[PDB]
Design a protein around this nucleic acid. Sequence first.
RNA 1: CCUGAGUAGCUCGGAAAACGUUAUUUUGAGUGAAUCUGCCCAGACCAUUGGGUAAGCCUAAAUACUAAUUAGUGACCGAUA
RNA 2: UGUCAGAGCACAUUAAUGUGUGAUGGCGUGCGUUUUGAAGUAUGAGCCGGCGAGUUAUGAUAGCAAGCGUUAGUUAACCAGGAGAUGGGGAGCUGUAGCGAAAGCGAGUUUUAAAAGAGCGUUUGUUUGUUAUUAUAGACCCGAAACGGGUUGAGCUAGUCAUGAGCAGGUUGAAGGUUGAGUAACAUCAACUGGAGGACCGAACCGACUCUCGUUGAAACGAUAGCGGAUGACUUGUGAUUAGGGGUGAAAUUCCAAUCGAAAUCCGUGAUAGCUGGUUCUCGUCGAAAUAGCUUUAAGGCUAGCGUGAGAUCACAAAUAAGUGGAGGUAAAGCUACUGAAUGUAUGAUGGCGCCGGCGUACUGAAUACAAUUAAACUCUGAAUGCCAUUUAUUUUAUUCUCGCAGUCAGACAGUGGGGGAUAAGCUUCAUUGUCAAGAGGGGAAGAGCCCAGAUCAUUAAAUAAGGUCCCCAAAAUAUACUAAGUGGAAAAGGAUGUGAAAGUGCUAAAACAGCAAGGAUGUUGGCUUAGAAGCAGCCAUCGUUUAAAGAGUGCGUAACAGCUCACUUGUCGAGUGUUUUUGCGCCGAAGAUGUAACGGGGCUAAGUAUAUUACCGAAUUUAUGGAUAAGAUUUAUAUC
RNA 3: CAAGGAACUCUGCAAAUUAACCCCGUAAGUUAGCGAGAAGGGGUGCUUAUGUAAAAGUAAGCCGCAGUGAAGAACGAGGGGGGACUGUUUAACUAAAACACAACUCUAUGCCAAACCGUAAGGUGAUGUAUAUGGGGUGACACCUGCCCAGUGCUGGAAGGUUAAAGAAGGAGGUUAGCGCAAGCGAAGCUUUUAACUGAAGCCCCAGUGAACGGCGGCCGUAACUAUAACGGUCCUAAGGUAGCGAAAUUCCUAGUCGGGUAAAUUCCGUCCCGCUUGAAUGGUGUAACCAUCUCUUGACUGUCUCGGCUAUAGACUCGGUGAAAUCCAGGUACGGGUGAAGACACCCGUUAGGCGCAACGGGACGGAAAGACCCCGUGAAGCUUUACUGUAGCUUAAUAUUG
RNA 4: CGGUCGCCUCCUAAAAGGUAACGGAGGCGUACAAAGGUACCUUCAGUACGGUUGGAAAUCGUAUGUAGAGUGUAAUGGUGUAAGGGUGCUUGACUGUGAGACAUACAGGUCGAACAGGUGAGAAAUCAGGUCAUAGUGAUCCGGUGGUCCAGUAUGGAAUGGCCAUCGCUCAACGGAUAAAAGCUACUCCGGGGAUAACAGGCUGAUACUGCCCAAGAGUUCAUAUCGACGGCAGUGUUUGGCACCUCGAUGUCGACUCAUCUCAUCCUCGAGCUGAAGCAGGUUCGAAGGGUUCGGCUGUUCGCCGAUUAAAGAGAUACGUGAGUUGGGUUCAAACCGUCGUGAGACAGGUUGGUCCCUAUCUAUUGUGCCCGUAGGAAGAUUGAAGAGUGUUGCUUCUAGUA
RNA 5: UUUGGUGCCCAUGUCGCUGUGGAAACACCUGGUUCCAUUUCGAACCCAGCAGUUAAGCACAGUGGAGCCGAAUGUAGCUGCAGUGAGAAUAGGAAAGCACCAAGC
Lengths: 182, 86
Amino acid sequence: MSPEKYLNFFKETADKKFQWLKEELSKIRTGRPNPKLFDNLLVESYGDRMPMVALAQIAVNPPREIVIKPFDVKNNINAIYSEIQRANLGVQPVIDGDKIRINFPPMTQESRLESIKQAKKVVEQIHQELRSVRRDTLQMIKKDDHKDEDFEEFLKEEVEKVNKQYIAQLETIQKQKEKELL
Amino acid sequence: SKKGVGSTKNGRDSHAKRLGAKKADGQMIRTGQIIYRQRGTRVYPGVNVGLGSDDTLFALSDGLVKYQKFGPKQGKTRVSVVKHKL
RNA sequence: CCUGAGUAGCUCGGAAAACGUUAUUUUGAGUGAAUCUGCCCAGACCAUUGGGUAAGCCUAAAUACUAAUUAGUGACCGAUA
RNA sequence: UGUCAGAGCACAUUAAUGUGUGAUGGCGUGCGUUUUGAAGUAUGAGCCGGCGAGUUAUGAUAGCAAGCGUUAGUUAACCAGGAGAUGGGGAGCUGUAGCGAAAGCGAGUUUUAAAAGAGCGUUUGUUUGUUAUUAUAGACCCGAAACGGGUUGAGCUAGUCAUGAGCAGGUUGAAGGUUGAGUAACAUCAACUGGAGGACCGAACCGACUCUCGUUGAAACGAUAGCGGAUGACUUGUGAUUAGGGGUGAAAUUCCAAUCGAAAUCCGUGAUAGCUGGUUCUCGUCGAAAUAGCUUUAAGGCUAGCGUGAGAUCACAAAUAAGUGGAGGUAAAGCUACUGAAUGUAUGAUGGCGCCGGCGUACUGAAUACAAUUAAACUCUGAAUGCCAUUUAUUUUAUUCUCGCAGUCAGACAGUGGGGGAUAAGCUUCAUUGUCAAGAGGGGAAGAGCCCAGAUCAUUAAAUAAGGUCCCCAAAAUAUACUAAGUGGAAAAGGAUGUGAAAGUGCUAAAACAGCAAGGAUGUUGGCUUAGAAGCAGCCAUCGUUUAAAGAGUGCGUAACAGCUCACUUGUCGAGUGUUUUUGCGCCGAAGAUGUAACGGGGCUAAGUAUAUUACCGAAUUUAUGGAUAAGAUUUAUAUC
RNA sequence: CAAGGAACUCUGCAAAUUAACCCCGUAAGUUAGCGAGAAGGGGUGCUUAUGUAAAAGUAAGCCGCAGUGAAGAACGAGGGGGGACUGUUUAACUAAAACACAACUCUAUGCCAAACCGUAAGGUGAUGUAUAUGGGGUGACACCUGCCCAGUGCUGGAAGGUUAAAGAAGGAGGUUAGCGCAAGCGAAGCUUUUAACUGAAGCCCCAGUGAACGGCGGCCGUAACUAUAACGGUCCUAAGGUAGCGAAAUUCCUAGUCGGGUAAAUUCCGUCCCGCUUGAAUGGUGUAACCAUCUCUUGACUGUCUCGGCUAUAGACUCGGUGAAAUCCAGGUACGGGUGAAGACACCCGUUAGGCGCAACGGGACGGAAAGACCCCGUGAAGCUUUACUGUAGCUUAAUAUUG
RNA sequence: CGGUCGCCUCCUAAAAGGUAACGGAGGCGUACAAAGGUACCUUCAGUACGGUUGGAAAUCGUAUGUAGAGUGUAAUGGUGUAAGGGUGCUUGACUGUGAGACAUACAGGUCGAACAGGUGAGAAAUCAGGUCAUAGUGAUCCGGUGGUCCAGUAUGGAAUGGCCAUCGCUCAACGGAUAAAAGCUACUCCGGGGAUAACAGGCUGAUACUGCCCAAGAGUUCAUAUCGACGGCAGUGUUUGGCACCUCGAUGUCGACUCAUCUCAUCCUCGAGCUGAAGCAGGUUCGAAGGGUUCGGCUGUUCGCCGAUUAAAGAGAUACGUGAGUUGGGUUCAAACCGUCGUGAGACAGGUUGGUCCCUAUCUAUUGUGCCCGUAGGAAGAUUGAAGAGUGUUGCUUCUAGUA
RNA sequence: UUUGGUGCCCAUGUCGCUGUGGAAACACCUGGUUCCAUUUCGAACCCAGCAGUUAAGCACAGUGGAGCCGAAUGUAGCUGCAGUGAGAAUAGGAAAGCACCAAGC
């Protein structure tokens, strides 16, 4: 591939990796407003694994609560209401008619510590794997351009700055996770 | 700043050959003297005009050179050898 | 009867020759004739022809040069020369 | 750092508008150097005195003169003598026939069947003297790191050998063995023998790891305060020892006489130096290039072109104007006349589809018509300018050739057309037009490339060019308007009843605008809908009624309302009332750090700007006179052009 | 020098703090030797007496503000990294994480040894004698040194192909005696030419030798997602780094995460193992002690600092004597703006300054010495390395004379 | 390092020709007894119409079509009975030449009337010395092959030499220095360059920063309370740049300490205005440069991160200011290791340890203090003020008042 | 001058549409018997003649339908702000023209 095509392939792989990383960081305990914290965790509806988007809708009326809207209030709201409680939430939920409104008081300083530690370690694993793929791409590049040094150096900083941009995006998303954690 | 160079992909040509006409109107010329250099026939041969194997147009007799227009709309050009007073 | 044998020479590397190896000459290695009927050479060589017979030596003369002496000179330098 | 002058002062000479000196006015940013170029913050030069760098030997070529001169000239060498020319001396050479590879032939040869056709031949010179150039000689002066050879250094360090010395003092107390206890015996325990230990502290000594001072030092590595070793991997003395494509090296490219990727000394060698530096009398005349090609080549070198000098050509040559003639395919313009692209619209192809070959295809859209288009590599066409040749007229011996000597390629700037870069760059690449380089001056605030312009010299003479006229600073005023920004004398898009003028545009003394007063409703809270919008949350139509007047409401204002208010119409009073457009000068937009800092300044509302007039100033320009002189001509009077 | 006390800072550089003698007490580790002056406390005086050969020590009294009263006297502890250590190192920048080093391992050498030097005798080795010498590498001690002979180098092997000089099986031609009408054939001498075949060593060839150079992977499916990789298949290689360690003198990301450290620490300590480019004698891990070794923390300690100042000198200043240097085109050598070969004491514009000094301190004169030495070029030099070329020392092979 | 070195085609190239580019577009290191020639015969592509399989596209019949077909080929073109196709015939795809032109510094390369002889095609006049054309090729030294009316070292031959023809040579750096030659040197040095470096300085302002406008929209509504795309205008010099310049016979830097200054695009203290400004705490826009705007840990790190504190811990410039004021911590001498690379000298825009900063002040400016003169008869006091300079920081608590 | 061939120019010329005409002709037309000829074949060609025609080619008239061509202004483009001079668009013509020879006339 061309060096720009090398960047494109690396960006595709990094986009998949970022989808993965967002998926894991979502489930990790926070102040818990993440719609995808609940989404990547399947629910036990009548003893069966079910999702939430394909079954219900999510909303946030106040900026400290979450609202779940199912279609059925006699057969479907219970299957999600049972699994909302006794989970990583640690809060007592209530139902207001056709919607479950769950409040999320801030976590204790200790559980928040392990949650942040594990989130940072997950981001570290993603970082190490992304750098490994970057080194693989650089190996293909040294198989590719071995002629003009000034051009090969240009390719080196091209890959480096692409990596820095993706690192910045991942760190910004981590900061978003940390702020909504508050 | 000082980056790599190479593969400009362009900037190549050949030696510009002296192509075109070889006589001026009003010049008294002789036989076997070349008048025009071209490819194909952009200038058509008139009386006493010979063709050399490199698509060259030369005179065949002694006389003066003149230009004439021919073709359906007179867009084509001929060169004729109008001989001097003889 | 004799006239200058490891001789001339042939080959392997050479060098000198204007010649960067070519007639010719010389040898570190090998090889090695004829006896003036012969040999050498006449820029490979061959025949005829020409000339001389190597394989011993010496040789004033014109030759370079002044370290100096004798007399003299300098379209030589004059104490920064 | 002085010039042009110059008050005054003191004098009086190669006696002459004299000398010295200058209160003060005008003017003025060194010399060589190399570069496109330096007052240069580019380099060298403190100054002074001498000295200090293109010669020679030979040979050739070119120029000028001479001797001889159509078989002449001339001798190399050698000899006679004054260290002399000279004479004796033709040894040979050049020119006297060339062609062909040569044989060979020859006023012809060779190619060739051919002397066809072509090449050269089809005939002048020799030798010296001067100058210049070239060639071999180190061959203008000087500067390299460098190489080899011949030698000397181990006295300094290093290495070993033999001879010796030295380690003040005080410590700690190992191994080993004896004895006694213990232990089956050991192992072990205590005393003793003992004083070993790349053992300790610590003199001297060895080395110098660190702080400070020092840095043309007291010192070419120190002073002082700390440091390690200081019984051994120990320091030293004496004599020898190993020497340089070599030795030595607890190894670092260490050391080998304060210096060493390999010491110094003498020579080859005066090595080489496309790179630096310099190169010493006068004057006259002419007087380029920084471009092209080639290059183990880009700093260099070779050839061209160019300049210059001698000759000839000397108007058929070359230019300058006038004219004719040709090409182009540039600009423009167009692109159903192409090429690629591409848009608005119509019947609508192919038709997907729907559809029982048609039926809608509301999509893709052929071609066509439509009105426009974009192109350096688009051109149905299609300019001009220019270029060439050509005719007429002027000029030249020349921009023609040969010969001798060259020089330059690292150009730059401004304008035009560009390209690249960004129609960024005082940038690069180009072509063209001019400048500097190689040539100064005035304007331009001072400025190499801008404008005017081309300088023999002296002028205390005139006309001027560009350009300028309030003052600095020579140099003008009148009239017409604008300006109130100091615009002039930084600015952008946008904005603005700034402002002047121009053009038209409605009413109107039956009274125009305005100022202000009165109403301004109505079905009607029209409905969708907001529990709460109905004249104004959001949406839909947004009309008629009475009225001069009136909008499902101009807005304001309300949860809805309401209410206020206006368009609309009338009224009080009574002379101006509007945008419609285009131009001059304006304002904002306009914030950065030595001192105003985007008129030269003081200042300027003219001393600013544009408009017509007559003026003036003002250049090394031109003219004038005077002096010299160069190239030429009547001609030698030493006169003129 | 009142107080603080490393807060200044790349870092306790430096300085201060500790000392000498006697008496208590001294740990971890430990390879028993050390650690140890460990860590830490008390006293050192005068007179009398007890005291001994001399003391030391002790009792009583005596106070000073303080009694090795002056003198010269290790500061210490902990953590981490490297190296075993004591030591050698660039004379005159760098004293070490380097080198050396005992030890370990590999290799060659049977004597007139290998080796090294010299041309050569000859000499060390060595007048040694394989437990000795020489080389290569790793460098207390303890435990290991995983795979691969692909290519290379070495050793061994001989068939096979390939192999010189040289020898001659043999071929061809010239000159011409002669034979020939020509044409031509052509004896002998010389002439000229390399080909049958022989021709070694050696190379290609085959094995072993990696504690000899050295190197020692990918693709796909599958692990409560999964990029990961426990796993299973495929391709390639000679084998695909085994162990061990693993942000290390190695880690770009990185200042990686984590806990301690720290109020607050891009440094530090241990850990996390996909480790850009770790890695096992071009060795790996623990590793006792030690370093004029490096770094961090800590008790004390101080004008390093907070925050600087004073006393004495030697200067600095003056007086008398003596007295040089670098620099140096010439100068009477201001300011701001602009200009320029783009940073103006000399230029133009405006401003101001009587002239000459002395003492500090040096903005500028793109200050001084140093024809760039940083980078580039020169058809420059020099050295160094090498499957760059050509030679060549040395070693080895064949022929020939020695040599039958 | 890239790419190129030779040659040809289009634009660039601005209408004679021609003109550079590391500018924009492509190729050649050729093909052919036909694709040369001669004589004769013949005329498009495409599109349309109608037809067995058979259509979009196989082909024919016709019309139409100006040749966009085709031309051995890269592009230029031309090429409408042609420069193209079909038939037959030969291979002039001649020998010796050649007046004369082209283009050009040389070398060379391009055409060439016409002649002598011989032919071929066609009965023929006429044509044929290669293709419709332009790339399509390497001199020379040396060497080989055949022929030669050339010479044969005294002669005779021969060998051998000479002439013509022929072949070998990516001398592809392609006008080519030998038949034959790679790297390292931070161990390096010699001569040169601001014409070729990093920095500084200077020009430009792409970019960077800042300001502004247009305002869809978000904002119950309402662009401009607070923002504001979609887009542009500009400015600054200040971040990254382009520049190859006065300067490389020398303009010494990153940082740390000291000295600070000026400016505003103001951070606080000063003042004013608007609010989606109940108060308080504010946001907002401007005038506004007088003063001030912290400490500690880490990084050599300026910077940057963290903690604490005030009203705040503003931003730039002065050679990334500041050694003729101090230090070199890093950085950029050798020295050494780790990981990697080159096999090898070595290198790392990697880390790692240390690893020498010269000065007797000439002048101006600049801070103090004197000497002579002036200030007009000499001397001594006291002044005005001409001109400026220093200085213009600011917090907390309480009362008014828990009042509005 | 009418017809046929043919000469210069090589669409202002043409292409097309509506008619007329051939006595002599030019042409169609009748055959492959003959020389010759077909990538084949009397299609073309060559031999030999006009039974039939103005059909068509052909010429003359009208037709400006398509296409071609095209009056002036100015600017565009340019050369020292005057000159130079467009293209395009437009009216519009053009239904080719100059000839020679042989006959009929």
